[PDB]
Design an enzyme around this catalytic site. Structure first.
Site, PDB file in Angstrom:
ATOM      1  N   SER A  17       0.864  -1.189   0.000  1.00  0.00           N
ATOM      2  CA  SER A  17       0.000   0.000   0.000  1.00  0.00           C
ATOM      3  C   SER A  17       0.899   1.237   0.000  1.00  0.00           C
ATOM      4  O   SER A  17       1.802   1.337  -0.845  1.00  0.00           O
ATOM      5  CB  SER A  17      -0.982  -0.100   1.158  1.00  0.00           C
ATOM      6  N   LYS A  62       4.390   2.003  -2.341  1.00  0.00           N
ATOM      7  CA  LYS A  62       4.937   3.167  -3.034  1.00  0.00           C
ATOM      8  C   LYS A  62       6.350   3.429  -2.545  1.00  0.00           C
ATOM      9  O   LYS A  62       7.268   3.663  -3.340  1.00  0.00           O
ATOM     10  CB  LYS A  62       4.069   4.412  -2.804  1.00  0.00           C
ATOM     11  N   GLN A  98      -7.449   6.740  -7.512  1.00  0.00           N
ATOM     12  CA  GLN A  98      -6.565   7.773  -6.993  1.00  0.00           C
ATOM     13  C   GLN A  98      -5.730   8.329  -8.140  1.00  0.00           C
ATOM     14  O   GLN A  98      -5.257   7.579  -8.998  1.00  0.00           O
ATOM     15  CB  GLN A  98      -5.647   7.194  -5.917  1.00  0.00           C
ATOM     16  N   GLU A 110      -3.767  14.610  -0.230  1.00  0.00           N
ATOM     17  CA  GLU A 110      -4.055  13.583   0.764  1.00  0.00           C
ATOM     18  C   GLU A 110      -2.895  13.323   1.711  1.00  0.00           C
ATOM     19  O   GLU A 110      -3.121  12.910   2.855  1.00  0.00           O
ATOM     20  CB  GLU A 110      -4.428  12.264   0.068  1.00  0.00           C
ATOM     21  N   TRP A 163      -9.481   2.217  -6.657  1.00  0.00           N
ATOM     22  CA  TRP A 163      -8.606   3.256  -6.105  1.00  0.00           C
ATOM     23  C   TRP A 163      -7.154   3.037  -6.500  1.00  0.00           C
ATOM     24  O   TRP A 163      -6.409   4.006  -6.699  1.00  0.00           O
ATOM     25  CB  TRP A 163      -8.734   3.269  -4.578  1.00  0.00           C
ATOM     26  N   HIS A 212      -7.316  -5.893   0.475  1.00  0.00           N
ATOM     27  CA  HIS A 212      -6.128  -5.059   0.271  1.00  0.00           C
ATOM     28  C   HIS A 212      -5.040  -5.449   1.266  1.00  0.00           C
ATOM     29  O   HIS A 212      -5.267  -5.450   2.479  1.00  0.00           O
ATOM     30  CB  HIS A 212      -6.507  -3.577   0.415  1.00  0.00           C
TER      31      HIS A 212
END
Ligand SMILES: O[C@@H]1[C@@H](O)[C@H](O[C@@H]2CO[C@@H](O)[C@H](O)[C@H]2O)OC[C@H]1O
Ligand SMILES: *[C@@H]1O[C@H](CO)[C@@H](O)[C@H](O)[C@H]1NC(C)=O
Ligand SMILES: *[C@H]1O[C@H](CO)[C@@H](O)[C@H](O)[C@@H]1O
Ligand SMILES: *[C@H]1O[C@H](CO)[C@@H](O)[C@H](O)[C@@H]1O
Length: 381
Positions: free
Chosen positions: A191, A195, A237, A245, A289, A325
């Site tokens: 998640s 990144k 997203q 965010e 998303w 997720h």
């Protein structure tokens, strides 16, 4: 070696994906060695447009090590020439018994990661959130990294996280008593930490294997493709939302999120910075998303760099649905283990993994609308 490195391309304007195989100055890549210089240029461009400045190794990096049971503590101090210092102490979970002659292979797991780690691999738990906070836009400039470099330093939180990984690998090089094979270090995260893990593998060349898990927008998805998804009704997203965010990108990125075609990079080039080292990323189509089509197209574009270098099988991508997720589906354990077996455990495992279910919602992937280059056969060693 690479001459003057371009970090800004003022006249750039390309609605499709930037070409990996041409330098900013218009020189075409021709040799495998040319990729080293192109990666250095991509690094400068990504820093300038979206990631902020990644500081080099500081003058003071000290490390001490202690072990209790099967848990090691690597106590790291980092300091600048002005006497400022910070300290952090990641822990390492070891397999039991005699290690291989060259030490244990190691995976640096952002906040523990969410992949199963095979039993012959040590796990280092990296508290990246302490290095750079990531609660919301309120977290800007907060974390250990900014207690060294200053809260107004341009480094994004993810760039600060990379810097921390680089100090960990410095500390391992300086600490042979930690019994880690420094040539067999991987990185993983899920998640928002996925990144982060992609950024680490891209920018820190000492990482042998990069494993981003469900990293989504700002990870293995491309900005331009996610803009296309959101314009066509997928609830993804995208660049515009992500900078409001959290603090995963530099404040300078705000100047470009409405003008993506003027950015002379996208995250296919970010991912290609891992080349010629190894990477496999995992995505989940259950959550729009995460921008599913964008990840497939982005990694398909990045894949051409490994193809051009003659090492296509060092880059994998597996995209499935049917699970929560950051829950790990057992159906993908063979693909994950193939890359760990080959690139961290020195086994003769095949690593041809590039699969999707094509469940992209309201858009389709059309390579001809996004990839404009042919893949050259780069020559030499
Ligand atoms: O508040 C933000 C500013 O802090 C940001 O400033 C940019 C930071 O990086 C520099 O390279 C740029 O010159 C500078 O504009 O701009 C966007 C704004 O949202
Ligand atoms: C173009 O830029 C690259 C990267 O900086 C450099 O290696 C190359 O020599 C440049 N081309 C010319 C003709 O100077
Ligand atoms: C980005 O970085 C390059 C050098 O890395 C500079 O030449 C440029 O002006 C910009 O600051
Ligand atoms: C590259 O980046 C510079 C700032 O570093 C801009 O001034 C320029 O217009 C281009 O976007």
């Amino acid at each position: 070696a690479c001459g003057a490195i371009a970090s800004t391309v003022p006249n750039y304007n390309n609605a499709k994906l930037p070409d990996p195989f041409t330098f900013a100055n218009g020189t075409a890549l021709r040799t495998k060695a040319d990729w080293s210089c192109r990666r250095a240029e991509i690094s400068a461009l990504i820093q300038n447009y979206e990631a902020g400045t990644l500081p080099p190794k500081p003058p003071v990096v000290t490390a001490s090590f202690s072990k209790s049971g099967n848990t090691g503590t690597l106590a790291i101090t980092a300091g600048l020439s002005n006497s400022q210092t910070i300290k952090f102490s990641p822990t390492i979970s070891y397999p039991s018994g005699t290690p291989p002659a060259n030490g244990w292979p190691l995976i640096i797991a952002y906040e523990g990661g969410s992949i199963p780690i095979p039993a012959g691999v040590a796990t280092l738990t990296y508290s990246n959130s302490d290095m750079a906070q990531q609660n919301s836009a309120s977290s800007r400039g907060q974390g250990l990294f900014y207690q060294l470099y200053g809260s107004t330093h341009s480094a994004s939180a993810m760039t600060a996280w990379v810097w921390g990984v680089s100090r960990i690998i410095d500390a391992l090089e300086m600490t042979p008593t930690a019994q880690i094979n420094t040539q067999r270090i991987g990185v993983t995260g899920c998640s928002r930490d996925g990144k982060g893990a992609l950024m680490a593998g891209a920018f820190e060349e000492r990482i042998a294997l990069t494993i981003p898990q469900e990293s989504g927008s700002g990870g293995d998805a491309c900005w331009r493709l996610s803009k296309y998804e959101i314009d066509n009704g997928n609830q993804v997203q995208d660049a515009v939302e992500i900078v409001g965010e959290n603090v995963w990108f530099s404040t300078n990125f705000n100047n470009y999120v409405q003008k993506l075609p003027t950015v002379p990079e996208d995250h296919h080039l970010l991912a290609a910075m891992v080349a010629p080292r190894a990477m496999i990323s995992f995505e989940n189509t259950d959550y729009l998303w995460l921008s599913p089509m964008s990840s497939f197209g982005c990694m398909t574009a990045a894949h051409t760099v490994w193809q051009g270098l003659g090492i296509a099988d060092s880059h994998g991508f597996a995209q499935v649905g049917g699970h929560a997720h950051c829950a790990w589906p057992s159906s993908l354990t063979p693909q994950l283990n193939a890359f760990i077996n080959r690139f961290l455990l020195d086994q003769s495992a095949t690593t041809n993994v590039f699969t999707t279910n094509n469940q992209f919602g309201k858009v389709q992937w059309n390579a001809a609308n996004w990839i404009t280059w042919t893949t050259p056969t780069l020559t030499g060693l």
